[PDB]
Ligand SMILES: *[C@@H]1O[C@H](CO)[C@@H](O[C@@H]2O[C@H](CO)[C@@H](O[C@@H]3O[C@H](CO[C@H]4O[C@H](CO)[C@@H](O)[C@H](O)[C@@H]4O)[C@@H](O)[C@H](O)[C@@H]3O)[C@H](O)[C@H]2NC(C)=O)[C@H](O)[C@H]1NC(C)=O
């Protein structure tokens with residue numbers, strides 16, 4: 001078929017080993033900035049001692065720098081608090097003697113080239129969080145629950161509040177936080193007060209009361225608020241940093257139930273609502289651009305109690321794709337894929353030339369199922385969850401099983417090149433996988449119960465593989481390390497030698513394999529989401545299309561660190577299909593027309609009563625968030641009020 005010529009030579013001088021000696025217990029690994037190569041490894045022993053190593057060559061070599069931390073014990077609960085973007089900021093938290101007035105931290109702002117010791121006025125309880133806007137601003141919680149802020153990269157710390165439960169950095173250096181009063185975080189549960197500060201402690205606005213918890217997702221601020229003289233609670237949303245609030249058109253839940261933001265962006269949110277009682281599943285709801293109107297998207301969606309596992313996944317390598325796990329009435333688990341932001345859900349197409357397993361009734365008719373967080377959690381033989389990278393268009397890699405449900409059997413690895421529309425067995429049996437050079441190189445390692453010395457690699461998007469021995473002395477493989485963003489050609493293999501054990505990391509550079517830099521000819525045209533090429537509206541997902549330039553399976557070259565995915569939108573004509581029913585409307589039968597509700601029951605009535613103005617004055621239809629269609633159809637009707645249809649049954653006072 002097709003394999004790389006004279007590869008053994010191209011990799012030998014490019015392979016780079018490093019023996020880390022030690023390293024019983026902890027082994028933390030942190031990348032520090034993009035296009036640097038700075039990696040930091042932190043090993044903690046016990047009677048103990050700590051050991052820190054720094055690389056600058058993508059993990060090909062390290063230099064022990066415990067010296068830079070004046071040789072002290074470092075707490076791994078806090079780990080290595082790394083700064084955003086290329087701020088080069090690193091914050092290690094030291095262990096102090098019991099009687100101390102406050103903690104101690106080591107800090108670098110120069111990619112771990114120089115560390116600064118700093119004693120604190122408090123004892124940290126949380127990892128110091130960096131502001132997304134300014135890397136010099138940090139916030140933390142004391143063991144006393146006081147909110148401490150710093151405006152000088154942890155040099156000077158000022159307590160800005162005292163009974164803080166949870167705090168979070170918003171956009172433009174804002175800080176959101178809850179506070180208790182009568183006892184503790186656990187006590188005042190659902191009775192807490194949500195606050196905000198834009199002047200890092202100077203002023204404070206109470207932005208909520210009877211708060212159970214809060215969270216940020218995309219453009220929204222969600223907070224669960226507890227019912228007056230009741231154990232139940234419901235979601236409320238603010239798109240204006242707490243200033244204005246509005247109840248979410250979602251069910252209310254009990255103390256034994258939860259809400260989880262499965263996914264959030266500038267357009268909408270995927271919200272998991274736990275089903276009442278120990279079920280180990282809930283319901284997925286997709287929001288509108290206001291984060292208020294919700295559409296039931298998926299039933300019996302696996303999500304163990306509390307949080308807890310979920311197989312919910314954003315297939316980051318193709319627009320609108322998400323795979324998750326649903327629970328069958330006959331207590332089996334099925335994988336469901338959505339190509340249109342959870343509009344429509346369906347089974348994953350089984351690979352063409354693939355046989356159905358013992359889980360399936362028809363031996364010729366079944367689907368692909370994916371092993372993710374939940375499978376992993378059940379000590380099922382899954383070394384890795386599904387992996388997709390946004391720069392590697394259409395590629396999805398996962399351990400799955402072809403059949404009617406997720407099977408306990410030892411999984412093989414499956415790949416997709418079109419974002420989950422079509423699948424193919426990539427490798428037999430479990431493996432650890434990585435995407436290099438934006439789909440230029442796919443790299444694999446077998447999940448053996450005994451030592452290994454080989455790395456498998458592909459240059460044709462997992463269609464053809466090649467074995468390569470990287471070491472004479474095999475190792476008990478532990479994991480892989482590659483620079484986030486899947487742009488490098490440097491992969492770090494990690495393990496430990498057979499015993500008197502010692503950790504080691506062989507780092508291969510694939511620079512000589514892809515000695516040729518890609519050029520215009522190497523890329524071909526690809527219409528994302530193609531189903532029927534005859535159809536004019538083919539590839540129309542969420543109102544538009546996208547034509548890509550993708551490197552040929554054929555072409556075997558380097559896309560380069562500067563690689564820019566080139567895509568091109570084709571704006572489609574609006575149809576009813578680009579609209580969700582606003583509040584008080586529903587879609588009966590196969591029909592796409594949003595019909596007015598005969599009567600509003602459950603939580604629709606709750607909102608119909610306890611809700612508000614704009615959301616109730618419904619146009620009947622709303623444009624799907626992220627929907628960029630133009631022309632065609634539009635709901636030709638006036639903005640009509642509904643706080644009459646509910647109240648029409650209630651005897652009303654004067
Ligand atoms: C599922 O995964 C998808 C792929 O990762 C997610 O979609 C991607 O979302 C990102 C971020 O929204 C889009 O990338 C760009 O992000 C920037 C935001 O960065 C900063 O830009 C400026 C300058 O700093 C400023 O506005 C802020 O500081 C921002 O923080 C946007 O400004 C760009 O316009 C652009 O959106 C990707 O384009 C997008 N890709 C795809 C394939 O969709 C998706 O959101 C995930 N799904 C959910 C529901 O979360």
Ligand SMILES: *[C@@H]1O[C@H](CO)[C@@H](O[C@@H]2O[C@H](CO)[C@@H](O[C@@H]3O[C@H](CO)[C@@H](O)[C@H](O)[C@@H]3O)[C@H](O)[C@H]2NC(C)=O)[C@H](O)[C@H]1NC(C)=O
Nearest residue numbers: 036037056057058059060437483487488489490509511561
């Ligand atoms: C794999 O790892 C090697 C190091 O082991 C990486 O090498 C680094 O290569 C970059 C260029 O690609 C060098 O950056 C510098 O860029 C400026 C321009 O901004 C230029 O003026 C400098 O002369 C230099 O090229 C970097 O110094 C170099 N580092 C080392 C230690 O060799 C390599 O980039 C990694 N491979 C991939 C594909 O990411």
Ligand SMILES: CC(C)(C)CC[C@H](NC(=O)c1cc(Cl)cc(Cl)c1)C(=O)O
Nearest residue numbers: 213214215222223224258259260306307
């Ligand atoms: C308004 C929100 C942001 C959604 C929080 C609301 C709260 N959330 C949680 O308890 C919770 C939190 C996490 Cl991080 C994960 C899980 Cl699975 C559950 C609830 O259920 O009242």
